[PDB]
Design a protein around this ligand. Structure first.
Ligand SMILES: CCCCCCCCCCCCCCCCCC(=O)OC[C@H](COP(=O)([O-])OCC(O)COP(=O)([O-])OC[C@@H](COC(=O)CCCCCCCCCCCCCCCCC)OC(=O)CCCCCCCCCCCCCCCCC)OC(=O)CCCCCCCCCCCCCCCCC
Ligand SMILES: CCCCCCCCCCCCCCCCCC(=O)OC[C@H](COP(=O)([O-])OC[C@H](O)COP(=O)([O-])OC[C@H](COC(=O)CCCCCCCCCCCCCCCCC)OC(=O)CCCCCCCCCCCCCCCCC)OC(=O)CCCCCCCCCCCCCCCCC
Ligand SMILES: CCCCCCCCCCCCCCCCCC(=O)OC[C@H](COP(=O)([O-])OCC[N+](C)(C)C)OC(=O)CCCCCCCCCCCCCCCCC
Ligand SMILES: CCCCCCCCCCCCCCCCCC(=O)OC[C@H](COP(=O)([O-])OCC[N+](C)(C)C)OC(=O)CCCCCCCCCCCCCCCCC
Ligand SMILES: CCCCCCCCCCCCCCCCCC(=O)OC[C@H](COP(=O)(O)OCCN)OC(=O)CCCCCCCCCCCCCCCCC
Ligand SMILES: CCCCCCCCCCCCCCCCCC(=O)OC[C@H](COP(=O)(O)OCCN)OC(=O)CCCCCCCCCCCCCCCCC
Ligand SMILES: CCCCCCCCCCCCCCCCCC(=O)OC[C@H](COP(=O)(O)OCCN)OC(=O)CCCCCCCCCCCCCCCCC
Ligand SMILES: CCCCCCCCCCCCCCCCCC(=O)OC[C@H](COP(=O)(O)OCCN)OC(=O)CCCCCCCCCCCCCCCCC
Ligand SMILES: CCCCCCCCCCC1=C(C)C(=O)C(OC)=C(OC)C1=O
Lengths: 347, 80, 97, 48, 98, 105, 167, 171, 313
């Protein structure tokens, strides 16, 4: 791809999400989602192989279906309210359709079935964009419509995403599917706290984006898309194994790390609202996520897998890859828990 | 700036005419003295009913009848 | 109403003439895919959407916001021209130019 | 030629619109009595 | 509410269930998707014309334009799928199960 | 994250199409302009939670302007009782509801 | 019967959607969506939307479904379809029978069964079409809408040229 | 809710202006000149009251002042007016520009026998002022009392007592 | 009484299409240093009747068509759309006086490519489908400049009303302020009707499976389209004088101009070789479309800078 065309297309992805974040009219929300999907299709077809075309076709079909359901929810809102303000919806059917549409755009279970396929089909940088930047616009729409979101629907989606994303990553050896099921479980955690305190939704979103960007940046820096190619990293770059160790222990939510910060605050907001069974079962279900994170830490940092002879050639060459913000992201994804009360800046 | 223009006029006169007509479309309404009259004629066209005002007692510029002297006039449009 | 009658009359005359032409002589016994055509059809579709944006201009010239209207009209025709210029320079208009 | 004739057509349009404006109070009074007539007839038949 | 809205919503749900139950062709899925768009156009248009909501009269055009651009993108994806397998069958798009 | 860039910069990107009671071309009113103006001026500034309970009358009047469900239900009742009385023969329509009176103006 | 003309056109509209959504072949599906687009244009025309209905003909049918049938003719060259078609047809005519015998129905929303002429306005708009004026205001009031739509169409040109190249 | 209050069929009886629209369009400019005051009283009442039931009597004055307009044409200038509205009536769009000499004869006969001057281009579209004796409607939308607003923020902003109070943080 | 008006529109359409074939064969005769048909009728006037009777009793070609339904629908759609393009035409009064008649004609002419597409797919021949796809791509290409030229011209009209376009041209023909639009319009209508030098359905570098009857139906739809686009070009750029008390002056005047413009189509097919397919694609996308966009900008900005914005009504 032409680098100028790449810059214009990435600015258009950003512009679509920004239009979603700044607009007061529902048509401009829908336009921001259309602009974002249209611009992100070439980022997925960047390398021109049949797996990327299949991933882009599956992504197109799910996001287009969600976009039509979103427009039907907008149109039903216009029936029962005569207006277009991005605020609470004025019909429970429109609220259900918009919550379904946003759950499809997020890839929350049981609309999760595209996220491991599309994440596996595309390069690591475009899957980084898919799992971090593409969550931002539907979460902002969920933020603004929460006075009309049905509680049982959003909590069903939340627990179903956490359980399905926990069990889905246990069977995986591909790193992109591991990050995709990890994404599904973390979005379940974000929507579970949404009607109680959406500031903790924003906190979980930001910490998830930092940790996921860290893991994708490590995978890009080591050119690893499988568990077994990530297991060669100790014989090539031993600092990278320490970084994937601390970041995966943080994504499991183990204190004293920063990824313990969201779920703890989420439990802290769900028990104030007298929900005790639900954050309990959510936290116990997240042990599945920690189990396959620990599987990756065993294969990468805590043991030394056998290498190959040709690795000795790669000892003679330094990493020329721009590992953009990787030390900053690695520090923020691990050492941020003593600054947990900084979350009030999200209020 | 002069050999280039003659070169592109010899090779591609369709594109030279296209960019010339488009440039005259862009810059000439800012240079026309009659662009103001377009706005004046559009705002002088009465699509709606001129809903009258309650005479509170002190409105010297608002007429009491259409044939009164005060009020907006269209002599500029009859004359031009 | 007169329009529905006229459409029904034209459709009835056309169906009657087709029924004659398929059943009057019954009395006697007696590809590989081309990317280029798809690209010109999609270029038609995109410029046709741009035309759909341009179609309310004879009504849009009647506004009292003429500086804004003229700016946006010239900007839409300019973006249609930039679409054509990008289609030109990236060899999209080639072998069916 | 189109400049002169479109300016004349705009003046003719303003004359048509002011004929409309001068007729609108009579039409509005007739429309009001028309709709109140029809609502009163519907009200009496609803009562019976 | 008014009786035509029932049928336009039912048309949307019929094209929704057509788009949510594939048979074989990706083109038939794209046709059901654009049928969903057409019904959204008609429903938006009938609301906006009934309400005499003047500025929203430009809304369905925008809804048309974006979605037809979306449709163009879909056709291009189909063509690239059809440039891989010879058909646009959805059962050929299963490499990402593993 | 509704970053309110439009209020921050003072630009009107999309507030103009948002409601029917906004400024329209040629001052064309919506059919529910008065009801929407009443519901917006009621519910302004008091928050959505207080607006659900304190502006219910204006919002029900405005929803009934928008969809005319109570009006059509009443016309259903009148027309159905009229058809029943025509079938029973206990009513006859007047000449002005049959087309024999040569309307007003 | 003629007071129900928008309702009759909407019945034909749903019948056309059951036609193509049962998916016989994408060419017959294209034909069913064409007939549906024509009758939906007729519905829009009967609510007074002349320009929006002509946009359905010019842009949806004459622009987009032409490209659909074109791509289908370049790519292409039952019992489930017929059963699905009669299923949707019987569901639609049961809806018709219920809302005509009761003058009210409730599938998900409550629907009146009177002719949909009843909801209209009883005045005039003077010397303009209100729908034409609201579409004309895209250039005066819809500046940001023009910007985002034209930018999305330019990006759409660029995106189609990127993904169809294969390089 | 309440019973709607409609005026009776006797209160809606008035002597109608039973002339066609070409007659009205031919007489329109002199009608807007001569019958200005009750028309503008009615339209002021009609935009202020926002209710036709509150505007009936003024409307009758409109229907009283139009007829006196036409009788004064029928007494003096019936034949040039008839020749003018017939030529207006031929056209499908009812053009003024097709009928300028019949207009000139009608305006000549009206300016001579009645002294009426036809309004210039721009005059009948002016916003005029109307002196009325009816009171201004204090609540034309019939709105009830608005809900009381929430209390605003006031007072000096002091630091948070013992910090964030988040579980064990002292700041 | 309205049905009489519909019949006096559409049956003289069919008669004028029947005698356009005679006019074409005679004019292409006398421009090729020979005579046309002058044997069958007096001055050859019974040649279209004899040719119609010959085509109606010719043997059916019996295709093993892919779809029977679209094979029937393509002539029905072609003839129906060819007849409905005439109903808003002001000559001086239209059959259907509609406010958006220009846009109606643009939409109903954009629908006419489905007859080409359905006839090409309904044939078994892959090469008939390839020729149909080429013809559809040609037609949708020149529809772009049709739409934009027509929009640029109607910026001087004020509306989409076809009858207003007579009022627009009372002082001057509209070919005087818009002759570049007029000439690109005329060549674009030439390429719309698959007419020479744009007839690649007759060149060796789509409806061959139809019998003689349905081929005659496609042919008469095509000549109805030719006469109609010449009438529409006449109304659009060469608007005649209209006296409302003598409408036949307008009818005679527009009829003479439309006949001369149809004969100009006949002159053009007897004067030039064909384009190659990429060459008329080059003519559209690289020559007519940049000038058409430039002139569309110019005809947006010109009524604002001259204070010559036409009325809406
Ligand atoms: C507010 C939020 C800010 C978020 C981060 C924004 C910047 C990073 C994102 C874009 C990016 O990658 O830029 C390159 C990026 C370096 O990223 P990198 O390639 O990963 O770094 C590797 C080496 O640093 C590259 O080494 P090199 O040899 O190529 O060049 C040395 C380079 C040379 O530097 C320069 O050339 C800079 C001088 C030119 C600047 C522009 C002039 C015009 O030095 C540095 O850049 C030193 C590192 C600077 C710190 C990076 C992180 C910034 C702080 C992020 C926020 C931390 C918040 C913690 C909160 C915790 C509690 C919640 O930044 C810079 O080059 C300049 C940093 C300036 C920071 C200013 C902070 C205050 C702003 C107000
Ligand atoms: C006149 C103008 C000039 C005046 C100058 C005055 C100052 C002159 C001296 C200059 C230096 C002053 C330093 C700051 C004051 C002391 C802060 C302090 O100790 O807070 C006690 C803090 C609370 O104790 P306290 O008895 O209630 O308060 C005593 C004061 O009133 C504390 O005051 P406070 O009540 O205002 O404290 C506020 C609050 C008090 O704290 C709380 O409200 C409780 C929450 C604390 C956070 C708990 C996080 C738990 C989960 C994460 C566990 C981290 C893993 C452990 C570390 C791994 C190894 C790196 O602190 C925070 O919220 C900050 C978060 C903790 C950071 C403490 C400052 C560290 C600066 C240097 C960093 C170097 C690396 C340190 C290790 C990294 C982890 C911290 O102690 C702890 O929480 C235990 C951890 C100890 C903190 C670090 C000690 C600082 C000095 C380290 C030097 C050696 C570094 C060795 C190499 C690097 C490591 C390998
Ligand atoms: C690139 C941007 C090109 C267009 C710039 C604005 C053109 C224009 O006339 O704007 C005035 C118009 C209209 O201004 P206006 O002066 O007509 O507004 C007065 C109010 N009304 C509409 C009721 C008459 O737009 C704005 O001022 C706000 C919308 C656009 C703001 C700029 C967005 C740029 C985004 C770039 C990314
Ligand atoms: C409507 C009534 C009738 C109208 C006129 C029609 C009658 C005449 C018909 C003649 C026979 C045509 C048969 C078919 C021919 C098809 C080929 C053809 O014509 O190709 C077109 C040719 C194509 O060019 P070409 O292919 O021959 O040339 C080679 C082109 N390149 C360099 C790209 C390889 O020309 C055009 O496209 C021009 C279209 C009209 C342009 C009008 C410009 C007006 C003046 C603008 C200003 C110029 C001055 C500079 C700026 C000044 C600013 C103040
Ligand atoms: C309220 C919240 C509002 C919003 C707040 C902000 C949200 C930020 C969301 C972050 C999402 C970032 C997605 C990545 C950047 C987008 C463009 C991109 O992917 O560029 C990467 C680029 C591509 O390289 P390429 O050549 O394509 O690789 C193929 C192999 N040669 O180059 C590379 O691949 C180089 C490898 C390193 C790239 C690392 C990029 C890190 C960016 C994320 C930083 C962390 C998130 C920001 C901080 C927290 C914010 C919540
Ligand atoms: C519950 C929600 C749906 C309710 C309506 C059901 C309609 C009837 C269809 C039932 C399923 C029949 C069937 O065979 O479905 C599968 C079929 C696609 O499968 P295919 O490969 O074509 O056939 C092999 C068999 N699986 O699937 C299809 O082709 C289904 C196409 C559905 C189109 C909807 C038409 C209108 C339906 C009624 C209104 C809703
Ligand atoms: C394969 C199927 C068969 C194919 C062959 C036959 C069909 C193809 C050829 C016929 C195409 C039919 C097109 C019908 C609509 C055309 C648009 C239209 O009506 O525009 C004219 C006019 C708009 O102008 P305006 O002046 O504003 O309206 C009067 C207001 N004073 O609007 C009016 O005057 C409005 C008049 C009332 C509303 C008319 C509605 C007509 C019926 C609906 C469409 C019927 C056909 C549907 C399928 C067509 C094929 C897609
Ligand atoms: C600022 C005003 C508004 C501008 C935008 C609106 C334009 C309206 C017209 C629409 C044009 C859209 C398409 C433009 C495509 C341009 C790129 C191009 O054509 O490059 C290729 C061409 C060489 O042609 P080639 O590739 O060989 O094609 C086969 C034929 N030989 O390369 C060339 O022939 C070079 C073409 C560029 C130079 C032309 C210079 C004309 C100057 C006229 C006078 C100045 C006018 C004022 C504006 C400044 C223009 C630079
Ligand atoms: C019943 C009304 C007439 C039906 C159509 C038949 C007559 C018109 C087309 C016949 C025709 C003529 C005269 C003709 O001259 C000709 O050659 C150029 C044809 O073949 C291409 C024809 O098809």
């Amino acid at each position: 791809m032409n680098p100028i065309i790449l810059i214009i297309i990435l600015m258009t992805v950003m512009l679509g999400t920004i239009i979603v974040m700044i607009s007061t009219h529902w048509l401009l929300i829908w336009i921001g989602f259309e602009m974002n999907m249209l611009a992100i299709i070439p980022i997925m077809m960047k390398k021109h192989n049949p797996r990327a075309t299949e991933a882009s076709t599956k992504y197109f079909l799910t996001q287009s279906t969600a976009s039509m359901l979103l427009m039907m929810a907008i149109i039903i809102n216009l029936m029962f309210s005569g207006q277009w303000t991005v605020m609470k919806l004025f019909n429970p059917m429109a609220s259900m359709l918009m919550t379904m549409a946003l759950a499809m755009k997020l890839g929350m279970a049981p609309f999760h079935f595209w996220v491991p396929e599309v994440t596996q089909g595309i390069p690591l940088s475009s899957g980084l964009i898919l799992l971090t930047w593409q969550k931002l616009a539907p979460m902002s729409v969920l933020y603004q419509i929460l006075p009309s979101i049905n509680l049982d629907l959003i909590l069903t989606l939340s627990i179903l995403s956490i359980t399905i994303g926990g069990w889905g990553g246990l069977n995986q050896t591909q790193l992109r599917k591991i990050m995709a099921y990890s994404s599904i479980a973390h979005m379940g955690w974000m929507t579970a706290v949404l009607l109680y305190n959406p500031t903790m939704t924003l906190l979980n979103l930001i910490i998830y984006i930092i940790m996921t960007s860290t893991m994708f940046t490590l995978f890009m820096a080591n050119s690893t898309t499988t568990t077994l190619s990530l297991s060669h990293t100790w014989n090539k770059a031993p600092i990278m194994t320490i970084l994937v160790l601390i970041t995966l222990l943080s994504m499991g939510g183990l204190p004293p790390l920063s990824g313990f910060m969201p779920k703890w605050m989420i439990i802290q907001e769900m028990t104030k609202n007298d929900s005790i069974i639900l954050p309990t079962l959510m936290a116990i279900t997240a042990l599945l996520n920690l189990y396959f994170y620990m599987r990756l830490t065993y294969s990468t940092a805590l043991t030394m897998f056998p290498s190959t002879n040709n690795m000795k050639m790669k000892w003679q060459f330094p990493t020329t890859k721009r590992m953009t913000l990787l030390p900053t992201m690695t520090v923020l994804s691990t050492m941020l828990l003593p600054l947990t009360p900084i979350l009030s800046i999200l209020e | 700036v002069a050999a280039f223009l003659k070169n592109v006029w010899a090779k591609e006169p369709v594109l030279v005419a296209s960019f010339a007509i488009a440039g005259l479309a862009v810059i000439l309404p800012t240079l026309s003295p009659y662009t103001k009259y377009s706005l004046m004629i559009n705002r002088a066209t009465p699509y709606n009913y001129p809903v009258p005002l309650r005479d509170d007692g002190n409105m010297p510029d608002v007429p009491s009848h259409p044939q009164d002297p005060q009020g907006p006039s269209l002599e500029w449009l009859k004359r031009l | 109403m007169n329009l529905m009658i006229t459409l029904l009359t034209n459709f009835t005359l056309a169906t009657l003439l087709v029924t004659i032409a398929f059943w009057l002589p019954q009395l006697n016994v007696y590809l590989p895919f081309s990317m280029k055509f798809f690209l010109v059809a999609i270029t038609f579709l995109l410029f046709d959407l741009e035309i759909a944006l341009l179609l309310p201009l004879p009504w849009a010239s009647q506004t009292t916001n003429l500086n804004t209207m003229l700016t946006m009209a010239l900007l839409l025709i300019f973006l249609l021209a930039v679409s054509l210029a990008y289609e030109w320079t990236q060899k999209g208009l080639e072998w069916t130019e | 030629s189109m400049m002169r004739w479109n300016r004349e057509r705009r003046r003719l349009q303003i004359e048509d619109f002011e004929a409309r404006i001068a007729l609108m109070p009579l039409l509005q009074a007739e429309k009001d009595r028309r709709v109140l007539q029809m609502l009163r007839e519907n009200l009496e038949e609803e009562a019976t | 509410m008014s009786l035509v809205y029932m049928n336009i919503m039912m048309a949307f749900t019929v094209s929704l269930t057509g788009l949510l139950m594939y048979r074989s062709h990706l083109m038939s899925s794209l046709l059901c998707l654009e049928g969903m768009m057409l019904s959204l156009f008609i429903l938006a248009t009938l609301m906006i014309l009934n309400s005499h909501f003047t500025l929203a009269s430009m809304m369905p055009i925008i809804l048309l334009v974006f979605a037809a651009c979306e449709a163009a993108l879909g056709l291009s994806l189909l063509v690239m799928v059809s440039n891989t397998y010879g058909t646009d069958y959805v059962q050929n798009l299963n490499l990402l199960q593993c | 994250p509704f970053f309110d860039v439009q209020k921050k910069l003072g630009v009107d990107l999309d507030h103009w199409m948002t409601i029917q009671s906004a400024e329209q071309p040629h001052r064309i009113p919506a059919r529910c302009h008065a009801f929407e103006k009443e519901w917006i001026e009621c519910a302004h500034g008091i928050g959505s939670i207080r607006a659900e309970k304190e502006c219910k009358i204006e919002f029900e009047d405005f929803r009934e302007c928008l969809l005319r469900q109570k009006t059509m239900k009443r016309l259903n009742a009148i027309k159905r009782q009229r058809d029943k009385l025509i079938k029973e023969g206990k009513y006859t329509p007047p000449p002005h509801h049959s087309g024999q009176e040569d309307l007003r103006p | 019967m003629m007071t129900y003309i928008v309702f009759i056109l909407s019945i034909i509209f749903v019948m056309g959607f059951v036609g193509f959504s049962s998916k016989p072949s994408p060419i017959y599906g294209g034909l069913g969506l064409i007939v549906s687009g024509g009758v939906g244009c007729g519905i829009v025309l009967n609510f007074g939307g002349s320009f929006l209905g002509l946009m359905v003909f010019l842009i949806y049918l004459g622009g987009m479904m032409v490209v659909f049938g074109y791509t289908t003719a370049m790519a292409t060259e039952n019992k489930v379809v017929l059963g699905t078609f009669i299923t949707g047809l019987l569901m639609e005519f049961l809806m018709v029978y219920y809302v005509l015998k009761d003058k009210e129905v409730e599938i998900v929303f409550k629907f009146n069964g009177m002719g949909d002429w009843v909801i209209y306005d009883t005045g005039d708009s003077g010397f303009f079409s209100e729908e034409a004026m609201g579409i004309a205001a895209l250039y005066s009031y819809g500046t940001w809408l023009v910007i985002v739509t034209g930018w999305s169409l330019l990006i759409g040109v660029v995106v189609i040229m990127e993904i169809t190249r294969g390089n | 809710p309440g019973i709607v209050e409609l005026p009776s069929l006797e209160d809606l009886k008035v002597q109608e202006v039973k002339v066609s629209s070409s007659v009205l369009k031919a007489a329109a400019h002199h009608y807007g000149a001569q019958c200005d005051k009750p028309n503008k009283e009615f339209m002021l009442c009609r935009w202020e009251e926002k209710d036709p039931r509150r505007c009936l009597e003024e409307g009758k004055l409109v229907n009283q002042c139009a007829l006196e307009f036409f009788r004064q044409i029928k007494r003096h200038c019936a034949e040039p007016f008839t020749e003018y509205w017939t030529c207006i009536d031929y056209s499908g769009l009812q053009l003024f520009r097709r009928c300028r000499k019949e207009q000139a004869q009608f305006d000549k006969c009206v300016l001579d026998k009645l002294g009426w001057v036809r309004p210039d281009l721009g005059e009948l579209s002016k916003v005029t002022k109307v002196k009325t004796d009816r009171p201004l409607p204090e609540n034309p939308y019939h709105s009830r009392a608005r809900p009381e607003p929430n209390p605003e923020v006031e007072g000096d902003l002091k630091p948070a007592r013992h910090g964030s109070r988040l579980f064990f943080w002292t700041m | 009484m309205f049905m009489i008006n519909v019949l006096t529109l559409i049956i003289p359409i069919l008669l004028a299409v029947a005698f356009l074939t005679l006019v074409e064969r005679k004019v292409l005769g006398y421009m090729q240093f020979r005579k046309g048909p002058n044997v069958v009728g007096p001055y050859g006037l019974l040649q279209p009747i004899a040719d119609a009777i010959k085509l109606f009793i010719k043997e059916p070609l019996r295709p093993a068509t892919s779809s029977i339904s679209m094979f029937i629908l393509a002539p029905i759609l072609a003839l129906t759309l060819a007849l409905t393009m005439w109903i808003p035409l002001p000559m001086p009064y239209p059959l259907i006086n509609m406010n958006l008649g220009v846009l109606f004609m643009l939409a109903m002419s954009s629908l006419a490519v489905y007859s080409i597409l359905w006839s090409g797919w309904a044939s078994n021949s892959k090469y008939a489908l390839i020729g149909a796809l080429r013809a559809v791509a040609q037609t949708i290409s020149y529809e772009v400049t049709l739409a934009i030229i027509l929009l640029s011209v109607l910026l001087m009209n004020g509306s989409f009303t076809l009858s207003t376009l007579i009022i627009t041209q009372e002082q001057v023909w509209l070919i005087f302020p818009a002759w570049p639009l007029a000439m690109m319009w005329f060549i674009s209508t030439l390429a719309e009707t698959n007419r020479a030098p744009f007839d690649l359905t007759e060149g060796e570098s789509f409806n061959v499976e139809y019998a003689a009857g349905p081929f005659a139906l496609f042919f008469m739809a095509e000549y109805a389209n030719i006469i109609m686009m010449n009438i529409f070009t006449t109304t659009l750029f060469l608007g005649a004088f209209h006296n409302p008390y003598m409408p036949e002056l307008y009818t005679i005047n527009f009829t003479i101009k439309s006949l001369l413009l149809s004969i100009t189509f006949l002159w053009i097919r007897a004067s030039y070789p064909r384009f190659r397919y990429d060459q008329l694609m080059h003519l559209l996308w690289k020559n007519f479309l940049p000038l058409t966009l430039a002139l569309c900008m110019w005809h947006v900005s010109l009524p604002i800078l001259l204070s010559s914005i036409p009325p809406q009504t």
